[PDB]
Scaffold this active site. Structure first.
Site, PDB file in Angstrom:
ATOM      1  CG  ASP A 172      -1.675   1.087   0.806  1.00 44.67           C
ATOM      2  OD1 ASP A 172      -2.934   1.565   0.009  1.00 44.67           O
ATOM      3  OD2 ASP A 172      -1.953   1.976   2.301  1.00 44.67           O
ATOM      4  NE  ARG A 223      -4.032   5.970   0.891  1.00 45.28           N
ATOM      5  CZ  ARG A 223      -3.779   5.296  -0.373  1.00 45.28           C
ATOM      6  NH1 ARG A 223      -3.270   5.947  -1.292  1.00 45.28           N
ATOM      7  NH2 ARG A 223      -4.036   3.698  -0.713  1.00 45.28           N
ATOM      8  CG  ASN A 224      -0.422   4.585   3.082  1.00 52.83           C
ATOM      9  OD1 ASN A 224      -0.808   4.890   3.935  1.00 52.83           O
ATOM     10  ND2 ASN A 224      -1.090   4.296   1.852  1.00 52.83           N
ATOM     11  CG  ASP A 283      -0.937   2.579   6.458  1.00 49.74           C
ATOM     12  OD1 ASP A 283      -1.314   1.248   6.129  1.00 49.74           O
ATOM     13  OD2 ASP A 283      -1.788   3.057   6.902  1.00 49.74           O
TER      14      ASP A 283
END
Lengths: 305, 305
Positions: free
Chosen positions: A139, A143-144, A157
């Site tokens: 992932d 955003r991570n 994350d």
């Protein structure tokens, strides 16, 4: 079999924290900004405290902890410990500037090529490190990635991360919500994940940064992506991107996973480009941009076991 | 450092092509003749689609793409885009009449001095252009020149092309299959390549045309060339060549690279000769020779971004 994971899971006392202010709220739960003041030793550590109690929930958060506690690299978020109170709490190093996705969106007009190219390198280092630890993130996205400082970002994350066995080159998973717009073709069609499929997502992350926070396939619905990627289409070339940089993204998007570049190579390529930033990224006014008790405050990166 | 290469690499959808017929097959892969019909806009573009998947292969074809996408001149093949399907595909402008080498062989008895001299000029223009872009072709030969029409040829095949840095006047390469019979002495002895070594090959290309497609050093094996060129020997004077034209080839073959003519000069010299073709090329019966849905068909040269 495999190597013995001798990481240490630290369990902290609720009375060692000072939730200073709330940071997030919603999705899974609520995140707090606070300080960790280990008893005795005159040190104060800025932290992010992630805190109902459902067997489904706890089960997952502890897994994230297993993973975070197992990693140790300058470009991967360090897990400080957990607190076993009524409801579980994950204690991690505070990343003041938030996640990169928001940061590039909020600062566009002040982010130059030096920063763009250097972030790319740092992330590639983080990912290359996770590859060594035979760990598949699954992932990776803008955003991570958290921002400790404009000069230092970290991969975070691991709520879907997996540790591949001795010689288990792939990972066959089952159903479940997934960031389709960031995944390799093989993961959308056969739910397979490899370090190389992480590269694909890396490619989309780089694209997110270059476009200053645009949305991948902005418009096209999830169900079509699989169709589009097969048609031979890929995300467009960002305005500031020279063909050299975009030529690298495209590669991360080959259909043949083994044709894509390896994180150790992305590190080399971007490092070279980072030596002459203005030659690979054309940003208007580039050269003229600038980016950024507590007496016993020490960064988590300086507090060691 | 160097100038930012802001070329655009277009990625096309497999469903935008109509492979009409196969054109080549073997060596690297298979080439197709087809049409590119961008969605919507009523235009049909004749193209050559160059399509197994080996990391060694893809790596090289993408490099050719990097180069082709970076060039933009009437005498250099234009890259239309690529398709990232299972196996990669290079989409270029269709050159109906094939390569020049085959063409002169197949048409001898109908190729007069006007065409010979004009091709020479066009190629020199292409090469002079590549020099401006500080690009060293490294494989200029009659076979690497395509025919859009008997009146318009274009330089192609950049599978060995190199982009010289800011002030990197030479190019020191390593081992690898090389057209020895078309290379300067310095390239055979010290594997060095410069714009001037491209001139040498230009000289041999001109010779190939004048002799109507003969084979350079037809007989002598590769390993001897180095020896022969040092002995002071060069390709013979073609039958139709006046001493003026052959005097120019010979120069392209000086040992002292800086003594050879520069493409901008070859352009001037041949342009003058092209003004009175029969004065510089003696071809029997010269003056009496002649050389050559789809409603929305447009040549790639007329389709612009």
């Amino acid at each position: 079999g495999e190597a013995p994971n001798q990481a240490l899971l630290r369990i902290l006392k609720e009375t060692e924290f000072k939730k200073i202010k709330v940071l997030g709220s919603g999705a899974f739960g609520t995140v707090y900004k606070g300080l960790w003041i280990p008893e005795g030793e005159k040190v104060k550590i800025p932290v992010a405290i992630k805190e109902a109690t459902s067997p489904k929930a706890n089960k997952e958060i502890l897994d994230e902890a297993y993973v975070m506690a197992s990693v140790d690299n300058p470009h991967v978020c360090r897990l400080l410990g957990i607190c076993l109170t009524s409801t579980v709490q994950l204690i991690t190093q505070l990343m003041p500037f938030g996640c990169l996705l928001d940061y590039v969106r909020e600062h566009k007009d002040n982010i130059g090529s030096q920063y763009l190219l250097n972030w790319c390198v740092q992330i590639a280092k983080g990912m290359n490190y996770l590859e060594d630890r035979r760990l598949v993130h699954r992932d990776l996205a803008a955003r991570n990635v958290l921002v400790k400082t404009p000069q230092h970002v970290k991969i975070t994350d691991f709520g879907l991360a997996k540790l591949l066995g001795a010689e288990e080159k792939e990972y066959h998973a089952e159903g479940g919500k997934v960031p389709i717009k960031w995944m390799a073709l093989e993961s959308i069609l056969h739910r397979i994940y490899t370090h190389q499929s992480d590269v694909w997502s890396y490619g989309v992350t780089v694209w997110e940064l270059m476009t200053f926070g645009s949305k991948p396939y902005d418009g096209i619905p999830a169900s079509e992506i699989s169709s589009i990627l097969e048609k031979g289409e890929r995300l467009p070339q960002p305005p500031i991107c020279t063909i050299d940089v975009y030529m690298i993204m495209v590669k991360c998007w080959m259909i043949d996973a083994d044709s894509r570049p390896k994180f150790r190579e992305l590190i080399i390529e971007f490092s070279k480009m980072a030596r002459d930033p203005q030659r690979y990224l054309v940003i208007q006014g580039d050269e003229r941009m600038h980016l950024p008790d507590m007496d016993d405050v020490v960064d988590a990166d300086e507090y060691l076991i």
